[PDB]
Structures are given as structure tokens and as C-alpha cells.
Design a protein around this ligand. Structure first.
Ligand SMILES: *[C@@H]1O[C@H](CO[C@@H]2O[C@@H](C)[C@@H](O)[C@@H](O)[C@@H]2O)[C@@H](O[C@@H]2O[C@H](CO)[C@@H](O[C@@H]3O[C@H](CO[C@H]4O[C@H](CO)[C@@H](O)[C@H](O)[C@@H]4O[C@@H]4O[C@H](CO)[C@@H](O[C@@H]5O[C@H](CO)[C@H](O)[C@H](O)[C@H]5O)[C@H](O)[C@H]4NC(C)=O)[C@@H](O)[C@H](O[C@H]4O[C@H](CO)[C@@H](O)[C@H](O)[C@@H]4O)[C@@H]3O)[C@H](O)[C@H]2NC(C)=O)[C@H](O)[C@H]1NC(C)=O
Ligand SMILES: *[C@@H]1O[C@H](CO[C@@H]2O[C@@H](C)[C@@H](O)[C@@H](O)[C@@H]2O)[C@@H](O[C@@H]2O[C@H](CO)[C@@H](O[C@@H]3O[C@H](CO[C@H]4O[C@H](CO)[C@@H](O)[C@H](O)[C@@H]4O[C@@H]4O[C@H](CO)[C@@H](O[C@@H]5O[C@H](CO)[C@H](O)[C@H](O)[C@H]5O)[C@H](O)[C@H]4NC(C)=O)[C@@H](O)[C@H](O[C@H]4O[C@H](CO)[C@@H](O)[C@H](O)[C@@H]4O)[C@@H]3O)[C@H](O)[C@H]2NC(C)=O)[C@H](O)[C@H]1NC(C)=O
Lengths: 196, 207
């Protein structure tokens, strides 16, 4: 039997009008219809088959979606037709339902040749969020962010850890944690870090 | 046909000689027509004979589920031995095997740091105390909080996250009333992991 998975756009893509958010309908184990709420839609695009180490083909259909539709909770339905199973499989997907809540951002200074800078982001809803670090308006590359964790009041939290040379912290370059979320003004805040 | 799921001990069970660690082999979707289930267990490929298999139990979907439990020695688990469960049922073309063991790689000692609440979280009447734990391997770990020898239940802990040098980190958030914080009470983050001495460290924080 063929098997259908359906994936949401990336958080960052929906929050910035410049980027193009996509809903992806993956099919493992070998047609495509798309609806947004009721309405049938056409702009979807299939991909070159990606054969597998287990005699599987992986066929992927990508539909581009409007930022505002996704944010407003519209529902995306991927009806996969084929021969190797009778009834056309449906999957469906939409943004998590509920009042979006604004992340609260707080940077925390270190307690070797390297120090760990922390950015704790709490109290936000839905869990869709993107975190990034920069210095002198330049992107950092030595950072990792935990997945969102469900807090006891139903909001989410996470922490981002940025690792830099003890020396850069030393002079007092300023380090900046960017956070993007639907509940923030312009979908974007920043908190700032350096030593005192 | 049937399905097999094999589950490891909890981290805390292998790290404390007082607790008893177990590996658990669960078979579901056993049919009525072919209800007998046989388990064979192997440690590092050598058959063992002390597992305890429970009587089959009918589910509401009218399939059976059968469970076999094998107690493991703390040190076998920490020495990376491999536990295999082989399940035989007359509906299967061949027996199902699953194997499990501690994640492979050289253990690394966790570094535990506490981080106090920020100033600006001192307008609400709750504060957030932070216990960063990084540089550990493998990812099996247990993190808890206490004050005055009593556990603090109001905390949440991230899953271990794969760091870029191959170790793991996580943070734990403890939420307390701002008062308790300001009276200058002492909060304790406690961490259990194989690469710690006595498998257990403890870091404190207050004003
Ligand atoms: C034969 O093998 C194939 C292929 O498998 C791989 O390739 C071969 C060569 C071997 O090496 C395999 O071992 C490899 O795995 C098998 O295909 C697999 O089948 C699985 C079962 O049918 C299927 O299970 C489901 O997994 C879901 C998660 O899928 C995610 O995440 C994993 C990463 O861990 C990844 O493998 C998948 O591709 C998929 O990854 C996401 O892809 C989407 C789509 O593009 C990304 O989203 C988009 O990203 C773009 C940017 O690129 C853009 O941002 C778009 O906006 C955005 O939409 C997304 O970001 C990717 N994630 C990342 C970062 O990795 C699980 O959710 C799910 O579990 C759920 O349901 C289960 C029931 O099955 C429950 O158990 C569970 O609780 C959950 O509810 C599914 O189980 C595998 O994903 C699939 N692997 C792939 C590669 O597709 C095939 O099965 C096998 N045949 C058999 C049956 O023998
Ligand atoms: C017919 O019904 C059966 C039985 O189900 C119940 O009855 C039915 C009628 C319904 O009413 C249900 O509500 C009931 O649950 C169905 O059987 C299910 O099959 C599923 C696959 O079809 C299988 O899914 C897999 O589950 C794994 C998670 O299992 C955990 O977690 C869930 C809760 O999330 C839990 O329900 C399971 O019981 C199991 O719980 C763990 O139990 C272990 C073993 O005892 C515990 O381990 C021990 O713990 C003790 C202390 O207790 C000690 O510390 C020991 O040392 C230690 O070993 C552990 O603590 C428990 N954890 C939790 C969370 O409680 C998933 O891992 C797994 O995912 C993996 O496999 C996937 C492929 O399937 C991949 O996608 C994935 O990437 C992973 O690799 C599967 O999702 C269900 O577990 C199973 N339910 C039960 C009860 O076994 C049956 O499916 C249905 N049949 C039909 C035809 O409908």
C-alpha cells in the first residue's frame, strides 16, 4: 500500500511576506488534488521521483500558500490518487487553533576558551517560532535551539544556546538573539547581549 | 500479523544500584487464530533464561498483547551490552527480532550551570530559574529540582539536543513565586548521568 504524509510550512516562511511558505505532501511506498477549506486549487507542483534503497519511489507534491491563509487557520487537504490502493488517501493540515500569545524573550549571560550565551523564550502560542543569532548585524553559526516544550499553562517555551570565543565576549561585542513569531509586532523581536 | 516494540530501562534505574532496570518486549496485534507467542532473549547474542513473560491479555480491538520483561544488571547496561528479543508466532513468516542497547560512543561528563531570573521577570509574581546542562553523552539523563531537601514539582525540562560537537545539552525551567525567591531561599538543580561521579551532581542558586 502507498503512504501519505503532509507537512506544514516552515515558521519563518509564513511570518515574512518576502519568503514563500509551502505545504508539502510526501508519498512513500510506490496524481494529487489540493483544497484550501472547500475550494480546489491548482498551483501545486510535483517533483522528480526520488527512488529509494528499498525499491520505493518517493513522490513529493509542493503547494505554495498565502501567509495570511495559513495564519488565519485555513485548512489544507492533499488527496493522493493512485492505482496501488483503492480509495484515494486524504491527509489534512492547518495551523494549531487558539489565541496566539507573544513570546517573552530574555538573554542570559555566562556563568574555558568559550562561553555559552543563552536566549530563553517563553509563554508563546502556537509553537511555530524561529530563533537566530547575530553580531554586528552579521549571522552567527555556532548556535543550537531546543524544540518548543509545552509549559504547564498551555504556552510553549524553548532556549537557544550560542557558543562564541571567550575573547569576542571579552572585548564586549554585542550579541543579538532574534525571535520571529506571529504574535509579535511585525512578527519579530530582538534582545541584546554583552558583558557588564 | 503481530508487531514488536522493545523499550529500554529508564535512565535513573541503571544509575542507582537500589533501583531495578528492565528491558521490556511488547507484542501487539496477536490474532485469535494464532495466539501463542514465544519469546527468546539474548544478551550480546547469548541466550538467557530469566525473563518473566506475562499471560496474554485481550485488547478491546480483540487482538492480544503479550509482554516479556528482562531484568538487566546495571553494569551490563552501562558496559553497552545488547539485548535482543525474538518473538515467534505461528502467523509470522519468520520470528521478529529487535535489539536495544545504550547509545554507542565515549561517555562525557555533564556540565551543570544555574542561571538566575532576569530583572524584568521581577514584575510578575513568578520567577523562572534556569539549569543548563551541556556536553553530556550519551543522552540518557535525569534532571530534578529541590529546596530544603524537598522536591519542587513546578519545572519543565527540554529533550536533550544534539550539539555540534556530538555531545548533548538541555535546559530545565523551574517556576517559583517571586517571594520565595526574594526571602533568599536556595534552589537546587540535580542531575543524574553515567559520566558523573556517583552518577549524580547538584547545583544551587539563590539571590
Ligand atoms: C522505504 O524507505 C523509504 C524512504 O526512507 C528513507 O530512505 C531510504 C533510502 C532509507 O535510508 C530509509 O531508512 C530512509 O528513512 C521510507 O519512507 C519513510 O516511510 C515512513 C513510514 O511510511 C515515513 O514515516 C513518517 O515519518 C514522519 C516524519 O517524516 C519527516 O521527518 C523525517 C526526518 O526524520 C524524514 O525522513 C521525512 O522525509 C520527513 O521529513 C520532512 O519532510 C518534509 C517534506 O518536505 C519537510 O517539510 C517541508 O520542508 C521544506 C524544506 O525542504 C519546506 O520548509 C516546506 O515548507 C516544508 O513543508 C520537513 O521539514 C522534513 N522534516 C525534516 C526536517 O526532516 C512522521 O511524522 C510520521 O510519524 C507519524 O505517524 C506515524 C505513523 O507512521 C506514527 O508512528 C507517529 O506517532 C506520527 O504521528 C511517519 O511515520 C518516513 O518519514 C519516510 N521517510 C521519508 C524520507 O519520507 C519507506 O517507508 C520505506 N518503505 C517501507 C514501508 O518499507
Ligand atoms: C489494537 O489495540 C492495541 C493495544 O492498544 C490499547 O488498546 C486499544 C484497543 C486502544 O484502546 C488503545 O487506547 C490502547 O493503548 C494497539 O497496540 C498499540 O500498537 C501501536 C502500534 O500499532 C503501538 O504504537 C507504538 O507505541 C510506542 C510508544 O509505546 C509506549 O507509549 C504509549 C503511550 O504513548 C503506550 O501506550 C505504550 O504502552 C508504550 O508505553 C510504554 O510502555 C513501556 C513498556 O512497558 C514502558 O517501558 C517500561 O516502563 C517501566 C515502568 O512502567 C520501566 O521503567 C521499564 O524498564 C520500561 O521498559 C514505558 O514507560 C511506557 N511509556 C509510556 C509513554 O507510557 C512507540 O514507540 C512506537 O513508535 C515507534 O514505532 C513506530 C512504528 O510504529 C515509529 O513510528 C516510531 O518512529 C518509533 O520507532 C509505536 O507508536 C502501541 O504501543 C500499542 N499500544 C500498546 C498498549 O501497546 C494496536 O495498535 C491496536 N491494533 C489495531 C489493529 O488497531
Amino acid at each position: 500500500g502507498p503512504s501519505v504524509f503532509l507537512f506544514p510550512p516552515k515558521p519563518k516562511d509564513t511570518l515574512m511576506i518576502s519568503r514563500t511558505p509551502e505545504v508539502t505532501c510526501v508519498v512513500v511506498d510506490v496524481k494529487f488534488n489540493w483544497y484550501v477549506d472547500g475550494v480546489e486549487v491548482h498551483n501545486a507542483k510535483t517533483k522528480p521521483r526520488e527512488e529509494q534503497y528499498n525499491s520505493t519511489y518517493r513522490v513529493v507534491s509542493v503547494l505554495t500558500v498565502l501567509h495570511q491563509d495559513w495564519l488565519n487557520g485555513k485548512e489544507y487537504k492533499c488527496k493522493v490518487s493512485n492505482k496501488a490502493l483503492p480509495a484515494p488517501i486524504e491527509k489534512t493540515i492547518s495551523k494549531a487553533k487558539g489565541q496566539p500569545r507573544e513570546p517573552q524573550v530574555y538573554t542570559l549571560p555566562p556563568s574555558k576558551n568559550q562561553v555559552s550565551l543563552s536566549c530563553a523564550v517563553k509563554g508563546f502560542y502556537p509553537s511555530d517560532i524561529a530563533v537566530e543569532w547575530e553580531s554586528n548585524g552579521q549571522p552567527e553559526n555556532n548556535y543550537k535551539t531546543t524544540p518548543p516544550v509545552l509549559d504547564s499553562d498551555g504556552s510553549f517555551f524553548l532556549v537557544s544556546k550560542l557558543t562564541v570565543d571567550k575573547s569576542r565576549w571579552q572585548q564586549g561585542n554585542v550579541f543579538s538573539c532574534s525571535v520571529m513569531h506571529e504574535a509579535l509586532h511585525n512578527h519579530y523581536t530582538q534582545k541584546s547581549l554583552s558583558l557588564s
